[PDB]
Design a protein around this ligand. Structure first.
Ligand SMILES: *C(=N)[C@H](C[C@@H]1CCNC1=O)NC(=O)[C@@H]1Cc2ccccc2CN1C(=O)[C@@H](NC(=O)C(F)(F)F)C(C)(C)C
Ligand SMILES: *C(=N)[C@H](C[C@@H]1CCNC1=O)NC(=O)[C@@H]1Cc2ccccc2CN1C(=O)[C@@H](NC(=O)C(F)(F)F)C(C)(C)C
Lengths: 306, 306
């Protein structure tokens, strides 16, 4: 029993973190085989943050303008290139701790673990979601760029995020590991700001299923809803539309609990209209939307507490 | 900016997890140097869970009744002993990944990271607190026993918890790494149940300081309180008494924010009496008590967003 915001074990990623310095700027890089991946803004200077021309900045650099440190050991850079908003620094040493890995570009609503790092040294691990507005509600300070987000399947680390920017509302923007930003954001100092966000409906439903698995039914009701009628309510509460694909994805949780998806939708509809009336669900007084269906199956018992 | 439930990087602990089997029971062990530590209830059988005599059960076992598996490799047990509620299995191989470590017995209110494991394989990491009633609100299933809780300081892992039991309310009980239970609990099937719990006042105050550091002051007020008068209110709301030692521990956060501790106590008093009135603090609609003062300093900027 229990239900926590649960991150993946971070060891396989810890062994990949290094420090990258260019000029007076230091941040983190990800060392896989003989390449170190890092944010290209490591090459910027303070007077040229408004609209850096990265091609023009990078052509002025040599391999030896980049310092890479793995623990106490200097790795010599033997090549460099820019791919979108990341730099790939070829180094003279292949990382002996390189895990089996993939690069993935995730969809909004998916979750991942973040290994926050500073000066190439891991600091902490937490779970986040890609919000519908393509920001993440991370926890990051100066020097955290190049920290990565990931999921682990069997022994394979799927890297999905590299940290680049903090927006005016204190939320975060970054890229996939090929250097493409999530959302409309970019690596320049402009007026960019998070668009209006929405609540991830399919995730809220998954978490209500988690609560049932763990033995709590107080919020259920005798009603059902059509998908169309549910979505009319979702829209009023700034919830993402629920699609038939979401309904299909909730199939296994529905089967394990005996609660049809549209019946759980009727429960959620009532919770939105009535509030929780001072009660909690899985220790929260808010409807939680940063657990996917997969996250629930991963953490919960396969046997419902009936 | 941001503030998350942040666990320590788990890699140093991952490298210590093994599987221990005795009879038909399998659980996790912690392999440090040439010893594997695990819950002694690995030697129990289903018909003798109500009041096992562990001394009598263990004398009937040989070294070769214990199977220890590290990944795909069998470690041969060459000695065994019982210390309180843990078994120490001496093995023929010292763990080459043993980190610098200590065993610590923590005080109630302190937090730690849990590496949940099954069959010797790490599954996930989350943060918990030792509750005032010496339970932990963990997330654990069958096979999770022997999973450990820890903090990391510099390169040194301080192990503070090993998982043993789930109580009827779905919360958890376990031991220090010397096998002494936290709280009145034990490794037998009885009517033991969590005592009444309280909210960890010093931690709530620390988290209010975190909210100020991160730029939010909405909940402050112009009042102050004496410690005695605050504690009269704390008691009414089932909060732990605040001591002068707690006030001293909050010193650094008070200095960084310019908010005297007793003034933050007056803010908390008002929050308890008035509620949050539909607002949130650091994304929570409840007053959070599983961040210590140290946790706040560890995660937050040293510069307040004034
Ligand atoms: C990475 N090390 C750092 C992470 C930030 C620092 C505070 N919290 C974080 O998450 N990233 C930056 O400081 C970036 C780097 C950058 C590249 C090109 C141009 C300008 C910058 C400055 N950075 C910002 O995140 C700034 N934000 C923005 O400019 C914008 F809001 F995204 F538009 C700022 C946080 C104001 C320094
Ligand atoms: C460890 N692998 C397992 C972890 C449990 C299983 C469900 N969630 C958990 O956290 N621990 C047990 O199953 C223990 C072992 C044990 C030792 C001696 C005597 C009886 C047991 C059975 N266990 C329990 O946790 C049971 N709880 C209790 O007996 C009590 F509430 F603590 F009193 C029970 C969860 C009912 C199986």
């Amino acid at each position: 029993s229990g239900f926590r915001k649960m991150a993946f074990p971070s060891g396989k990623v810890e062994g990949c973190m290094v420090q990258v310095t260019c000029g007076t700027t230091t941040l983190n890089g990800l060392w896989l085989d003989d390449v170190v991946y890092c944010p290209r803004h490591v090459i910027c200077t303070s007077e040229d943050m408004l609209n850096p021309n990265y091609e023009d900045l990078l052509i002025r650099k040599s391999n030896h303008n980049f310092l890479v440190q793995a623990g106490n050991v200097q790795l010599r850079v033997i090549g460099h290139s820019m791919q979108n908003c990341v730099l790939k620094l070829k180094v003279d040493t292949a990382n002996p701790k390189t895990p089996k890995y993939k690069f993935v570009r995730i969809q909004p609503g998916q979750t991942f673990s973040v290994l926050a790092c500073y000066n190439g040294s891991p600091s902490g691990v937490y779970q986040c979601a890609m919000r519908p507005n393509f920001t993440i509600k991370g926890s990051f300070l100066n020097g955290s760029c190049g920290s990565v987000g990931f999921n682990i399947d069997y022994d394979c680390v799927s890297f999905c995020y590299m940290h680049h920017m903090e927006l005016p509302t204190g939320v975060h923007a970054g890229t996939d590991l090929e250097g493409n930003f999530y959302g409309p954001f970019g690596d320049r100092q402009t007026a960019q700001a998070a668009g209006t966000d929405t609540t991830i409906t399919v995730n809220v439903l998954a978490w209500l299923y988690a609560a049932v698995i763990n033995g709590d039914r107080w919020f259920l009701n005798r009603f059902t809803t059509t998908l169309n009628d549910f979505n009319l309510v979702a829209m009023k509460y700034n919830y993402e539309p629920l699609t038939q694909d979401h309904v299909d994805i909730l199939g296994p949780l529905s089967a394990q609990t005996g609660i049809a998806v549209l019946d759980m939708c009727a429960s959620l509809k009532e919770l939105l209209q009535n509030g929780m009336n001072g009660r909690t669900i899985l220790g929260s007084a808010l409807l939680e939307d940063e657990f996917t269906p997969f996250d629930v199956v991963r953490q919960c018992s396969g046997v419902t507490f009936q």
